[PDB]
């Protein structure tokens, strides 16, 4: 129900909800990647 | 890129395509094999008359 971002360097969940400048909670590293989606995808094995 | 050299002498045209070529001897010498993903885009306006109404309905 919230959005959860993975930190770039230290691999922690950060949960950026407030309108903040982007910042890791534990480190000072300033790059976030989204998590992988929960829905399923179908690939052909070709 | 002025009017004369840019637009009067040689001007860009539509109803055209551009693809990499590859050989195929099984065609006659007066045939070219157009891909499907180009022939769905390039169109020819065929006026409806008595000879081809049943073709153009399909």
């Amino acid at each position: 129900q919230p959005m959860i971002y993975i930190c770039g360097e230290c691999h922690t969940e950060n949960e950026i909800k407030s309108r903040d400048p982007i910042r890791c909670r534990e480190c000072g590293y300033r790059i976030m990647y989204k998590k992988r989606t929960k829905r399923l995808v179908v690939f052909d094995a070709r | 890129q002025g009017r004369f050299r840019g637009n009067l002498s040689g001007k860009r045209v539509d109803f055209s395509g551009r693809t990499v070529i590859s050989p195929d001897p099984n065609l006659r010498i007066d045939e070219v094999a157009v891909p499907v993903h180009v022939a769905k885009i390039l169109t020819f306006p065929e006026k409806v008359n008595k000879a081809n109404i049943n073709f153009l309905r399909k």
């Binding site: 959005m3 971002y5 770039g8 400048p21 982007i22 300033r30 790059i31 976030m32 990647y33 989204k34 998590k35 992988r36 989606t37 829905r39 995808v41 070709r46 | 590859s22 050989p23 195929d24 001897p25």
Partner: protein, 138 residues
């Protein structure tokens, strides 16, 4: 494994004949990564660009087809596939040229074929602008 022979006449001027089974087992398989970036700048007025969520269909409680791949924060998600004319970052800007009015300027995926979003990077500069980079894959 290259044979040097003349085969079937489809190899006339420098052309070369491949093997279908070699192509199926993995020969020459290649990945293409592209980029799609969007910036969310803060203006001289105290007004900011914003990312709306997925505009749902109220009739079926599913998002519309042009917004199908979005997450709940308007930014597309890793793992899902994109087709032609879908949105990736649902940007909206102020038309200040009293309340701010927003027009939609989404960042759509122009492309011939389907892609896979691999990672979505979200970071900022010091000027409060947000940089969002996707990494597409075919």
């Amino acid at each position: 494994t290259v044979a040097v022979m003349s085969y079937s006449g489809y190899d006339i001027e420098d052309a070369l004949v491949l093997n279908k089974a070699s192509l199926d087992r993995g020969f020459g398989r290649c990945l293409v990564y592209k980029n799609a970036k969007c910036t969310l700048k803060r203006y001289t007025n105290q007004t900011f660009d914003k990312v709306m969520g997925p505009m749902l269909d109220a009739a079926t409680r599913k998002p519309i087809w042009r917004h199908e791949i979005l997450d709940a924060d308007g930014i597309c998600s890793p793992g899902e596939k994109v087709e032609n004319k879908q949105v990736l970052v649902n940007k909206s800007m102020p038309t200040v040229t009293q309340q701010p009015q927003y027009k939609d300027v989404p960042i759509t995926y122009k492309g011939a074929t389907d892609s896979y979003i691999e990672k979505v990077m979200i970071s900022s500069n010091a000027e409060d602008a947000f940089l969002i980079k996707m990494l597409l894959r075919q």
